[PDB]
């Protein structure tokens, strides 16, 4: 019933893009696939935190369980969640 | 519904983000009535984007293709 090739938690299917991109490029790439970056609050207290940690979140910062984050020149992996 | 991880054809892989040696990771999966991923079972699947560079059942890191692993510590999956 589910074609989700990734992490499925509550109707949301997260598909990993293992290419390192900036935050804007990752957001645009998910948008081009009719998807968005994971919400930090949606995955922080779930088992997904072991996967989506240190990847781009929808809020503009890497999803962390917690110095001077300079995260405008950084490149990370990302997940896209959509329908 | 109860798979807290990656589900590929009846197999549910759960990620352990703690760094352990091959023996410790194998023992931890055994303590959970599980085994390390088979390299051939996940090499030609979409799971390779997740389980790459983690411990495999053969004693070596699961790497795409390729061909001292005794003091290394890596993450691992139990199924």
């Amino acid at each position, epitope marked *: 019933k589910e074609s989700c090739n990734g992490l499925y938690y509550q109707g949301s299917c997260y598909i990993l893009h293992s290419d390192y991109k900036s935050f804007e490029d990752a957001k645009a790439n998910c948008a081009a696939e009719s998807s968005t970056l994971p919400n930090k609050s949606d995955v922080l207290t779930t088992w997904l935190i072991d996967y989506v940690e240190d990847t781009w979140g929808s809020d503009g910062n890497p999803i962390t369980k917690t110095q001077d984050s300079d995260v405008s020149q950084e490149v990370r992996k990302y997940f896209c969640t959509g329908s | 519904e109860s798979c807290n991880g990656l589900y590929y054809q009846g197999s549910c892989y759960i990620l352990h983000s703690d760094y352990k040696s091959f023996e410790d990771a194998k023992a931890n999966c055994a303590a959970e009535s599980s085994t390390l991923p088979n390299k051939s079972d996940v090499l030609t699947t979409w799971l390779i984007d997740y*389980v790459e560079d983690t411990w495999g059942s053969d004693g070596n890191p699961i790497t795409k293709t390729t061909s001292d692993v005794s003091q290394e510590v890596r993450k691992y999956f139990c199924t």
Partner: antibody
Amino acid sequence: QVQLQQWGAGLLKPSETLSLTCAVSGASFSGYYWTWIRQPPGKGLEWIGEIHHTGNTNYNPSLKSRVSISVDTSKNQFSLKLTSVTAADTAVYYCARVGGYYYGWGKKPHWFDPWGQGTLVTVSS
Amino acid sequence: EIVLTQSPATLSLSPGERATLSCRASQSVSSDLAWYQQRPGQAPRLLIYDASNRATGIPARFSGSGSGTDFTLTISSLEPEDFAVYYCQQRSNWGFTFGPGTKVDIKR
């Protein structure tokens, strides 16, 4: 803004041991692999080895006989030792960072950013 | 071991021209290839990783393409700051190797 700084003996007699240290500020030290890359003067670049904060090391097979890379996590530093220094080891040595945050799972980062200013090591008696 | 080769050894172009450097591999490296620019007396500076993606703050005149065993770096219009040596890089098996490098000269 990641910053790297190197120091070490810039003049070595043959058969001595090379010792260089790289210090890191402005980034997550336990979040990337850290490498040493040497360029002999006027020639191309050669990768020496890499290390992670967990103690995992990878060495170039052509230099594995006499290359050791250590890590000081409490000081955000990592060192390089090259025993049996020959005249061929005269080079400018850079410490760099693997620019992809090493997650521990999935495809591995393959580029170097940023680079250190470089430390020339000259081999002569 | 995978060997990277770069051709030509030297590219002679006037300012404003389009420079096209190529890098070949002995066997396939997928998209795990990077490009660097090194000026005389300086450390190498990363230009493109994943063979296609520009680094942070690298001008848009630098472009990268190729996957497998053939890669090309392209500068649409050369600036006087762009006349330097360009190095090819890859990661495979357990190791990193570099190409011989290509120096972009001033055509005369």
